[PDB]
Amino acid sequence: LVGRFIHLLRSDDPDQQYLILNTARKHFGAGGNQRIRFTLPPLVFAAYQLAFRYKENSQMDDKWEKKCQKIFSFAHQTISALIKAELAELPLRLFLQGALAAGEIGFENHETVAYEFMSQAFSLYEDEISDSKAQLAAITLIIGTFERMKCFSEENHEPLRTQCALAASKLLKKPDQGRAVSTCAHLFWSGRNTDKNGEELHGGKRVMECLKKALKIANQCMDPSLQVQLFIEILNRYIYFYEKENDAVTIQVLNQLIQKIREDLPNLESSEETEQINKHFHNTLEHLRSRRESPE
Amino acid sequence: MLVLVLGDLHIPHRCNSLPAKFKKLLVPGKIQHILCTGNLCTKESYDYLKTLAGDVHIVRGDFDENLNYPEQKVVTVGQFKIGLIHGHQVIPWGDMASLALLQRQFDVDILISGHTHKFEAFEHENKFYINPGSATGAYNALETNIIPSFVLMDIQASTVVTYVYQLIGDDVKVERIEYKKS
């Protein structure tokens, strides 16, 4: 029974859409946890959509910022009801979406709401995500989403930065842990905060620290094939930050790491797996061949 | 012999159906390959995809209520090795340098990614990169102005021409790009 008619869509004039959103939540709520697993997330996304609609008519409405506050309170309420329906991966994703939207909109006190949505996602990550793969996917989504937010002051940016690094370094498997820390290096470079007047933080030394820790994890893998894989990956990440004019990356670091791959690389047994990894290294080398303005 | 590249349907999370015109132009039989990047969420969209062609290929999206769709895939069509991934795993989300990094990891001639909701097709370092965008023009937090768009490409030999369909207003505009395996 597709009660999920609600392809009403259409409507114009924000306030009427807000009231119909409340009516939809109210009607769907008597369906029990069985129905609200599917019916409610669409209303959460409709709330975010409606908040953006309120931002487009900023001049015509003098009360739109308070309207956005109430809209995000509505979204928070619906996501929390999803939480109470014993749901874990979905609510966290919804919270990340809400933090993204709240960061882009820009209404009064939106930074506090974006932070609160982020904290909620983290709260679900720490306690309700036990599985290895699910922890990896949840955390990597968190690093990715949080990397695009520019609505944060240093006050709020630092806790989420260090918390993301810490949470990524305590993953179950060691390869997963190294990958996550390497991905977390991006927060310490491409992150943006309110106090840099729009500038990227460009924390070169802060970037290196993350990459250094990634190598240390790769040695403890004790598994030739996977141990090797990481090395081509960490070097590649090093290339990204080098090619983005980061002075913190040196050519000596590149030479030592590249040598360390070259030394133990041949010592694996011939297979398709090692085949693709050799080609991966060869593609890295070839890309580095292109117009060298960087010694070796 | 031509492939249909689409994704980010987001039904029923953000959209109730595909655009009426898009439902019309998409007719079965004429396409024998399907590459899906986005989180089409519900299984209904998968069954609908199965009507459009026999060779349907999907990758896991961040919002897929999935039953073990793959996170990433590599498929060959005679010529060209194509990579299929939803893109949220590529950090920064829309950075091309990270996409080229992943290209080197895949060692593929064409890299298909999504989750940006912005169609983009270009050539970097003698390699090709496609991003069909949202076929339903679904909401995205990073962009207010989303253009419903999908991409179909036909491979005649060592040359592919990618035709990108976008629905601007009510008229269907199409852009054409072609790539030669270097």
Residue B118, chain A, CB below 8 Å: the answer is no
> Domains, chain B, ranges and CATH?
2-180 (3.60.21.10)
Distance from CA of A274 to the nearest CA of B (A): 13
- Which of B92, B109, B103 is closest to A287 using CA atoms? B103
* Contact call for residues B41 and B9 (beta carbons, < 8 A): yes
CB B38, CB B53: distance < 8 Å: no
Query: What is the residue-wise DSSP string for A78-97?
Result: HHHHHHTTT--HHHHHHHHH
d(CA B15, CA A6): 10
Kindly list the strands in the beta sheet with B2-6, ordered across the sheet, starting from the edge strand earlier in the chain: B55-58, B33-36, B2-6, B149-155, B159-168, B171-180
CA distance A283 to A197: 38
- For the packed helices B96-106 and A272-289, what is the interaxial angle rounded to 10 degrees? 140
User: Which letter does DSSP use for residue B177 in this model?
Assistant: E
Half-sphere exposure of B134 (CA within 13 A, CB side): 24
d(CA A17, CA A12): 7
Q: Do A100 and B17 touch (CB under 8 A)?
A: no
Gap between the Cα atoms of A101 and A98, Å rounded: 5
Can you tell me the distance from the alpha carbon of B166 to that of B146, in angstroms, rounded to the nearest whole number? Answer: 10
> Is-contact A99 A145, C-beta < 8 A?
yes
Residue B62 to residue A93, Cβ atoms within 8 A: yes
For A49, the enclosing helix (H) or strand (E) is helix A33-56
DSSP B20-79: HHHHHH--TTS--EEEE-S---SHHHHHHHHHH-SEEEE---TT---SS--SEEEEEESE
Yes or no, beta carbons of A147 and B92 under 8 Å apart: yes
Q: Among residues A4, A96, A87, which one has the least CA distance to residue A42?
A: A4
CA distance B147 to B25: 17
Of A48, A90, A280, the CB nearest to B141: A48
Q: Is A186 exposed, middle or buried (0-12, 13-18, 19+ CB in 10 A)?
A: buried
**Dist CA A246 CA A10 (whole Å):** 49
Q: Is residue A286 part of a domain?
A: no
Residues 6+ apart with CB under 8 A from A160: A115, A118, A146, A152
- Residue A104 C-alpha, separation from nearest chain B C-alpha, in angstroms: 7
Peptide linkage before B28 cis (omega within 30 of 0): no
Asked whether residue A46 is assigned to any structural domain, the reply reads yes
CA triplet B22, B137, B76: central angle to 5 degrees? 70
Secondary structure of residue A98 in the 3-state scheme: helix
Closest C-alpha to A44, from A64, A15, A24, A66: A24
Task: Give the span between the Cα atoms of A121 and B62, in whole angstroms.
Answer: 14
In terms of C-beta density within 10 A (0-12 exposed, 13-18 middle, 19 or more buried), how is residue A285 classed?
middle
In a domain? residue A212: yes
Q: Report the residue count for chain B.
A: 182
CATH of the domain at A209: 1.25.40.660
Helix, strand, or coil (residue A293): coil
Cβ burial of B178 (10 Å; 0-12, 13-18, 19+) is exposed
CA contacts within 13 A on the Cβ side of B66: 18
The structure tokens listed for A228 are: 């090797």
Q: Residue A259 carries which side chain, given as an amino acid letter?
A: Q
Residues 6+ apart with CB under 8 A from A108: A65, A66, A69
A122: its two tokens: 């983290």
Query: Hey, is A146 helix, strand or coil?
Result: helix
Across the interface, whether the CB atoms of B91 and A41 are under 8 A apart is answered: no
DSSP class per residue in A204-248: HHHHHHHHHHHHHHHHTT--HHHHHHHHHHHHHHHHHHHTTT-TT
Residue A247 resides in a domain: no
Cis peptide before B132 (omega within 30 of 0): no
Positive or negative: CA dihedral A167, A170, A172, A176: positive
Q: SS3 of A203, please?
A: coil
C-alpha distances out from residue A20 to A10, A161, B78, B91, Å: 12, 38, 52, 37
Q: Which residues pair with A203 in a beta bridge?
A: none
Note whether A4 contacts B: Cβ–Cβ < 8 A: yes
At which residue do the structure tokens 């601007």 appear? B168
B52 HSE (CA, 13 A, CB side): 25
Residue A186 in domain:
yes
Measured distance CA(A55)–CA(A65) in Å, rounded = 8
Residues 6+ away with beta carbon under 8 Å from B79: B155, B157, B158, B181
Resolution (angstroms) stands at 3.0
B50 touches chain A (CB under 8 A): no
**Count of CB atoms situated within 10 Å of the CB of B118:** 17
Question: Environment class of residue A4 by beta-carbon count within 10 Å: exposed (0-12), middle (13-18) or buried (19+)?
Answer: middle
| Residue A278, domain member (yes or no) | no
Tell me how many domains chain A contains: 1
Distance CA B71, CA B62 (A): 9
Chain centroid, CA A66 distance in Å: 28
Question: B19-34 burial, b if ≥16 CB within 10 A, otherwise e?
Answer: beebeeebeeeebebb
Question: How many other C-beta atoms lie within 10 A of the C-beta of residue B179?
Answer: 22
For the record, the structure tokens of B163 come out as 């035709």
Distance CA A100, CA B142 (A): 8
Of B97, B101, B141, the CB nearest to A100: B141
DSSP 8-state secondary structure symbol assigned to residue B140 = B
- For residue A77, give the amino acid letter: Q
Compute chain A's Rg from CA coordinates: 23
Cα separation, A165 vs A168, whole angstroms: 5
What do you get for the CA distance between the two ends of chain A, in Å?
Answer: 66
Measured from the Cβ of residue A63, the count of other Cβ atoms closer than 10 Å reads 10
CA distance A207 to A238: 10
Helix (H) or strand (E) holding B82: strand B79-85
Cβ atoms of A236 and B101 closer than 8 Å: yes
Q: Identify the CA nearest to B135 among candidates B116, B152, B149, B154.
A: B149
Residues spanned by the domain of A148: 14-221
Q: Exposure string (b/e) for A238-271, b if CB count within 10 Å is 16 or more?
A: bbbbbeeebebbeeebbeebbeebeeebeeeeee
Which of helix, strand or coil describes residue B159? Answer: strand
Check CB contact of B1 with chain A, cutoff 8 Å: no
Q: Is the peptide bond before B92 cis (omega within 30 degrees of 0)?
A: yes
